[PDB]
Design a binder for this molecule. Structure first.
Ligand SMILES: Nc1ncnc2c1ncn2[C@@H]1O[C@H](CSCC[C@H](N)C(=O)O)[C@@H](O)[C@H]1O
Length: 265
């Protein structure tokens, strides 16, 4: 097929949007968690109330509850940030260890020290650029890296780089995985994904907690099916939410409770 993909058309229409229109559209009909108590928790220094460190936790929870991924054994979390995913994985029955890597530093999130349930099996290391980290054995591989750009070409290249690095870690045998695809609608990214699906399996899913201001999808081990179809479906939904007559806003949802306490190691 010649011409632009649907996702590229979405991207173009998104780039043309004015400030006010962008912030209404961003959350139109999306799923959102109420982070109010988690923000007050952060500022009180409450590490034992079960409040997630970020909105990421809820996204991994959406996926795990639908069995799109089932964390087990040694979990590696690439781009762990504050630890939203690392700490949620540590709450999972058959997870034994969680190792998170993240760059940190100015402008970026440092891992937060929490006492959510299983906190004692989490080890997050800041100051790590994963593109230069030699792969290690894992049973579960998580990766939540992807910096946005108005250019789909710049996003395409970013995504491919992630896919190349992710393929390394996947070749070390993890059968459970969950990987953010920044820009899944560009032809080269599709080509690579389709190849990766042949070798490692899985499928691409859109998480409804994602904002309409991005087209991020997760390549997850528990999913299957035609990648092109899944992607186009998302483009169509995101486009269908554009140019709304009246903005109804997001559907709110309760945040995840991660509890507290250590677990047997
Ligand atoms: N090359 C790189 N190496 C390590 N971390 C990176 C990186 N590029 C971006 N990052 C980090 O990856 C993080 C992705 S957002 C992390 C969200 C996390 N899953 C959660 O639930 O909290 C950002 O904090 C960013 O600092």
């Amino acid at each position: 097929a010649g011409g632009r993909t649907l996702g590229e058309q979405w991207k173009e229409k998104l780039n043309a949007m004015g400030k006010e229109e962008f912030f209404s559209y961003r959350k139109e009909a999306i799923l959102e968690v109420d982070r109010t108590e988690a923000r007050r928790a952060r500022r009180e220094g409450n590490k034992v109330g079960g409040h997630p460190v970020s909105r990421g936790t809820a996204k991994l929870r959406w996926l795990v509850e639908r069995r799109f991924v089932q964390p087990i054994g040694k979990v590696v979390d690439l781009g762990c940030g504050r630890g939203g995913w690392s700490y949620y994985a540590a709450t999972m029955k058959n997870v034994q260890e969680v190792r998170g890597y993240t760059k940190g530093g100015p402008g970026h999130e440092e891992p937060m020290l929490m006492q959510s349930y299983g906190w004692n099996i989490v080890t997050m290391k800041s100051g790590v650029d994963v593109f230069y980290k030699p792969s290690e054995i894992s049973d579960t591989l998580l990766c939540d890296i992807g910096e946005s750009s108005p250019s789909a070409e710049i996003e395409e290249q970013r995504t491919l780089r992630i896919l190349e690095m992710v393929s390394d870690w996947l070749s070390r045998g993890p059968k459970e995985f969950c990987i953010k695809i920044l820009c899944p609608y560009m032809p080269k990214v599709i080509e690579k994904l389709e190849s990766l699906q042949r070798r490692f399996g899985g499928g691409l899913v859109r998480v409804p907690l994602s904002r309409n201001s991005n087209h991020e999808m997760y390549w997850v081990s528990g999913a299957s099916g035609n990648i092109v179809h899944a992607v186009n479906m998302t483009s169509q939904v995101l486009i269908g939410r554009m140019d709304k007559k009246i903005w109804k806003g997001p559907k709110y949802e309760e945040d995840v409770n991660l509890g507290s306490g250590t677990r047997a190691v």
